[PDB]
Symmetry: C4
Subunit: 80 residues, 4 copies
């Protein structure tokens, strides 16, 4: 990514790999190694993502928020 | 939250999202993004919560304790 | 414990909670909050434990080793 | 390993234990404590590995990449 990957990856049901980066983004990578999407938070994503029953991806950020991202990379909500 | 979310979220059986914050609290957030409760420890919650078979939430804190929280946010025990 | 709990807990099949501490120990805590045992490594246990199919607990340490502990707290092996 | 093990281990279906090290390698250790292989990245492996449905091991590195390693230790891809 653009910075250290301290975050630990999570794997979705279709094999998508989600991981944060110190570059501030949450990455969704296809199992073939090509980017599916990236979502920008306001600070390093050290937190490791979790996947809910409906596929929502949750991850914290050093920007103080817990993010809930939809599987298509669009923000569901953020909690401060 | 009030500080960086380094902690990695855990998801309960009803979809509740639990995560620590450097603001010293463990947060329980409803799947709609509204706060269910927060529990205050005495230091940053870098540790990532785990959920036991009965729903108890366990998480460490920089205050030296491992906390066991009930699903309703009331302390079960803390271990130093 | 004796220092910050940065490690993230793991839960065994009988509900035992395993977590590292910056005090250098891996802790096994009974679901009632009483200590089952502690195992001493040579440096902070920031790593979060994993539990194998036979119940062995694996965790890293800042002492450079990956530890394999038996469920009774006796060392199985360490790898440097 | 050659440096602190901050990474948290993952366990494969055959019991292999995967963990990163600040020495820059991802380690695959057999359940008997003998090395199965190690894979070198370009910086500390603080990230904790995840295992996909086909056994691929994914882990981040402070070198900015998310790595996808095959179960035999050969690189599948890396994503920057
Ligand atoms: Cu860098
Ligand atoms: Cu930044
Ligand atoms: Cu801040
Ligand atoms: Cu503080
Ligand atoms: Cu202290
Ligand atoms: Cu020390
Ligand atoms: Cu060292
Ligand atoms: Cu280095």
């Amino acid at each position: 990514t653009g910075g250290s990957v301290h975050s630990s990856p999570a794997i979705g049901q279709d094999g998508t790999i989600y991981v944060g980066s110190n570059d501030h983004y949450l990455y969704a990578i296809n199992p073939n190694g090509k980017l599916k999407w990236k979502f920008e938070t306001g600070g390093s994503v050290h937190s490791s993502p979790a996947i809910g029953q409906d596929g929502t991806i949750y991850v914290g950020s050093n920007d103080h928020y817990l993010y809930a991202i939809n599987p298509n990379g669009k923000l569901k909500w953020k909690f401060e």
